[PDB]
Structure 1
Amino acid sequence: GAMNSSNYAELFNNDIKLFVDDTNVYRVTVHKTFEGNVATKAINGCIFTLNPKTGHLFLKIIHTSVWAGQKRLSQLAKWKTAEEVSALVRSLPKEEQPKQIIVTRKAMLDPLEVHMLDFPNIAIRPTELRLPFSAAMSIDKLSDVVMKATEPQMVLFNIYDDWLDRISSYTAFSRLTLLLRALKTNEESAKMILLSDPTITIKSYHLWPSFTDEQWITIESQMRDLILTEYGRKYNV
C-alpha cells in the first residue's frame, strides 16, 4: 500500500525499488504577449527516477520538442513519464527490474499502472511522505545537463556520490532528503551553506562537495538550522 513513516525502512532492504518524481517533467515560463495576454513557454524538463538503496539515478531528460502540437500538456506529462519509466524498466535486465515503483504523486498511479500492464508483478505504490525531489533542479550539475540538452537523452548519476563507501543507505537517504528539503525552502541560503568554503570542491564525477565526516556534521546542522528558521518565518512561530 502507501508508503509513510511507519514503513520507512522497507526502502533499504534488498528488494529493488525505484522512486519516480515527475514534478520537473513539464516546466514553463509565464510571460505577457504583445497584445497583453498570458502565454506559456516551455523549457527542458526531467523525470527523476531513483533507487534509494544504491543512489543510482536515472535522469530522463524531457526536451521541449515532445510538447510540440499537443494539448492538455500537464496531463500528457504524466503519461510521457509513465511511457519513459516503462521503457527504462524494459531496457533493464530481468534481474535489475524493480519489484516496486513508488510515485511521489498519486496522479501518476493510473498512467504508470496502465504502462506497466506488461509487468503485473511490479507493484506501483503511492506514498504519504512529502519528499523534496522537486528540488533536484537546484543541484547545479543536474540543471546544467537538463538545460543544455538538444534532444531526448538519458543521463545516469549516483546522487550519493561516494557516501555509501562510509555510511549506510538509510543515512545517505536522510542526508539527501535533508539537503533537498533545505534547497527547496531557501535555495540561496542552502547553496551558500554548501559552497561558502572554496577549499572544499566537487569532484568532476560528483554532485556535492567532498566534505570530510566532520564537515558533513557541521553542514547537516547548518541545513537543519536553516529549515527551522524558515519554518518560523513562514508561520510566525
Structure 2
Amino acid sequence: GAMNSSNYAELFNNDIKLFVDDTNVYRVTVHKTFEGNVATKAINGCIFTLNPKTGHLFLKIIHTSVWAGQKRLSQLAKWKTAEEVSALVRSLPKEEQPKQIIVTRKAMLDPLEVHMLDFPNIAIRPTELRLPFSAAMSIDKLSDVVMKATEPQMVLFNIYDDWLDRISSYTAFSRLTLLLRALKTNEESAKMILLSDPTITIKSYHLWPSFTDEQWITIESQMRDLILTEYGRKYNV
C-alpha cells in the first residue's frame, strides 16, 4: 500500500528501496513568439532516484534532445522516467536491486508498473507524504551538472555527504527533507542561511557545508523558522 506517516520507519529498514521523483524531468521556459503567441523551450532535466537508507542518489540527466520531434511531452516524460528507472534496475546486480520503488507522484504508478513487468517481485508504491524532492535543482552542484550536460548522462552522488558517520538514516533523511522543504518555500533565504558564514566550506566531494554537530542544530533551527514564517507570510499568521 501507500507510504504514509504511519509506516514511515520502513524507509530505514534493511530492505533496499528507492524513491523516484519525476518533477524535474520535463522542464520548460514559457515565452512569447514574434507573432505574440506563446511557446515553450525545453531545458535539461533529471530523474531523482534516491535510496533513503544509504543516501545514494542516481541522478539521470534528461537532455533536451530526447524531446525532439515528440508530442504530448508531459505524458512522455512519465514513460521516459519509467524506462530509465527500469534500465537502472536492470543495470544493478541482483543483490543491489530494490525490493520496492516508491513514486512521489501517483501518475508514475502505471508507467513504472508496465516498464517493470519483468520484475514481478519489486513492489511499486505511491506515497501520501508531500516530499520536497522537486527542490533538488536548488542544490547548486546538482543544478550545475544538469545544466552543463551535452548528452544523456547518469551521475552518482551521496545526498547525505558523510552525515551517516555521525547520525542515523532516519535523522539524515529528516535533515535532508528539512533542507529541501526550506529551499522549496524560500530558496533565497534558505541559501543565505546555509552559506552566511564564509568559514564553513563545502568539500569538493560534498553537496552541503561541513557543519559541526552544533552548527547543524542552529542551521536546522533556522530552516524551521523560515518555513514557519513563510507559512505565516503566506497565510498571514
TM-score by length of 1: 1.00
Aligned to 2:217: 217
Q: Secondary structure at 1:177's aligned position in 2?
A: helix
- The whole-number CA distance in structure 2 between the counterparts of 1:199 and 1:232 is 32
Kindly provide the CA deviation profile for residues 83-127 of structure 1, in whole angstroms up to 9, marking residues without a partner as x. 000000000000000000000000000000000000000000000
Q: Post-superposition shift, 1:236?
A: 1.5
Kindly provide the CA deviation profile for residues 125-156 of structure 1, in whole angstroms up to 9, marking residues without a partner as x. 00000000000000000000000000000000
- The whole-number CA distance in structure 1 between the counterparts of 2:83 and 2:66 is 12
Aligned to 1:148: 148
- The whole-number CA distance in structure 2 between the counterparts of 1:9 and 1:100 is 14
- The whole-number CA distance in structure 1 between the counterparts of 2:64 and 2:145 is 14
- The whole-number CA distance in structure 1 between the counterparts of 2:129 and 2:121 is 24
Aligned to 1:229: 229
Work out whether 1:130 is the aligned partner of 2:130: yes
Q: Post-superposition shift, 1:229?
A: 0.3
Kindly provide the CA deviation profile for residues 51-89 of structure 1, in whole angstroms up to 9, marking residues without a partner as x. 000000000000000000000000000000000000000
Q: Secondary structure at 1:141's aligned position in 2?
A: helix
Kindly provide the CA deviation profile for residues 180-199 of structure 1, in whole angstroms up to 9, marking residues without a partner as x. 00000000000000000110
- The whole-number CA distance in structure 2 between the counterparts of 1:217 and 1:11 is 23
Kindly provide the CA deviation profile for residues 173-228 of structure 1, in whole angstroms up to 9, marking residues without a partner as x. 00000000000000000000000011000000000000000000000000000000
Give identity over the alignment, percent: 100
Kindly provide the CA deviation profile for residues 17-67 of structure 1, in whole angstroms up to 9, marking residues without a partner as x. 000000000000000000000000000000000000000000000000000
- The whole-number CA distance in structure 2 between the counterparts of 1:30 and 1:82 is 26
TM-score by length of 2: 1.00
